[PDB]
Amino acid sequence: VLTQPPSVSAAPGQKVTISCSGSTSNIGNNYVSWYQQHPGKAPKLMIYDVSKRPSGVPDRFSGSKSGNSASLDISGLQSEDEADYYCAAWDDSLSEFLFGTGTKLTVLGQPKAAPSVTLFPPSSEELQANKATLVCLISDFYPGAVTVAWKADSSPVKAGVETTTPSKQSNNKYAASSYLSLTPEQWKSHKSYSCQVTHEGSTVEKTVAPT
């Protein structure tokens, strides 16, 4: 539980705000904290006990709590800022700490762009190799953040999926790949398979079938 959006983005000096929502079992009663994890270094306590900063954190990094959801506001964004965040809290019912779905705050350096999906169907060979590997090619998007998940026909499922993380490319944009490995027969039966690349509110569901 505890959903933050996968995204946010804004200009080299403007404001922005990431949300956090869970339930009365958590956030609603228990104190919330927020962490900033740049690409490869470790995380850094940004805000704690709802609105508190460790002398070491600017005043622009603020944070409130309304009901069963907390929000981390930020103003005057700086390249510095651009990193991933996480809103965490303690859940009284599961007796164990909880982390957030995470959010990537990208500070606009170049014009947005939509992801270029390109779903490849199983290769004739591999199929023979008693295996079914579906490739969903994703590319050329500025805010390097998207969401991937598949759907065998009507219904969706994750049983057998593995998606990479974005990664900058020559042309300055990000680009990542998903994978839906199957059993050649699972490939046969279900009359339809689609790849869903949600991104910036607007999604894109590319489908392809056996024939």
């Binding site: 490869g40 006990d49 460790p54 164990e96 700490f97 290769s123 590997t133 024939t211």
Partner: protein, 218 residues
């Protein structure tokens, strides 16, 4: 200043155990609640367990509750995590963190974790396949199921590398790394230009040359 440096991780065939190790050096460890957090590649952070300053009570997340064990040893300011029955999903990076003094719900200082890798494999090679092409279409090669990480690619031995990008692999469940490469060309130049991928996997001492063709099928 504070200092926490994890240690003791790497590669381990599923099941048998392995113990991680964190060492504080920047305060009075003997009086600080300790935390274990891990992060798989890509997936966010997942909380694991917590132990008091004297190692009496501790809370684990069902996500392990019993598969793991978090003991500490204040005499040598070292924090531990015992991992028995290493399920594959457990592959990730292990962050060691110190919770505040009067706010155990606050991890103030973490350290660059240490990488865990639950994979029962030993050197293998590539399993190249053709991503039949179809403004102007794109096509590629689908390398799959290799164990030793390093693996490079090229198309036609270096003829205009533009319009190409080879993604990062991915540790599938079978603890096998797979990755693909892709190219873009004039959909008008189908059946006139020969496109093939110059694959390469040293750990397997292999080169591969799959020559992709247009899908006159279905």
């Amino acid at each position: 200043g504070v200092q926490l440096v994890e240690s003791g991780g790497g590669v381990v065939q599923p099941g048998r155990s392995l113990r991680l190790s964190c060492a504080a050096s920047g305060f009075t460890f003997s009086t600080y609640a300790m935390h274990w957090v891990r992060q798989a590649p890509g997936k966010g952070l997942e909380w694991v367990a917590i132990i008091s300053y004297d190692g009496s009570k501790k809370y684990y997340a069902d996500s392990v509750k019993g598969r793991f064990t978090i003991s500490r040893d204040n005499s040598k300011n070292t924090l531990y995590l015992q991992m028995n029955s290493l399920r594959a999903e457990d592959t990730a990076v292990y962050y060691c963190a110190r919770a505040s003094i009067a706010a155990a719900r606050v991890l103030d200082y973490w350290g660059r974790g240490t990488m865990v890798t639950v994979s029962s494999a030993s050197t293998k090679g590539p399993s190249v396949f053709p991503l039949a092409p179809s403004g102007t279409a794109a096509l590629g090669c689908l390398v799959k199921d290799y164990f030793p990480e390093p693996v490079t690619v090229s198309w036609n031995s270096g003829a205009l590398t533009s319009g190409v990008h080879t993604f990062p692999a991915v540790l599938q469940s079978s603890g096998l790394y797979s990755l693909s490469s892709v190219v873009t060309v004039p959909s008008s130049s189908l059946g006139t230009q020969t496109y093939i991928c110059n694959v390469n996997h040293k750990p397997s001492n292999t080169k591969v040359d799959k020559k992709v063709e247009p899908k006159s099928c279905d």
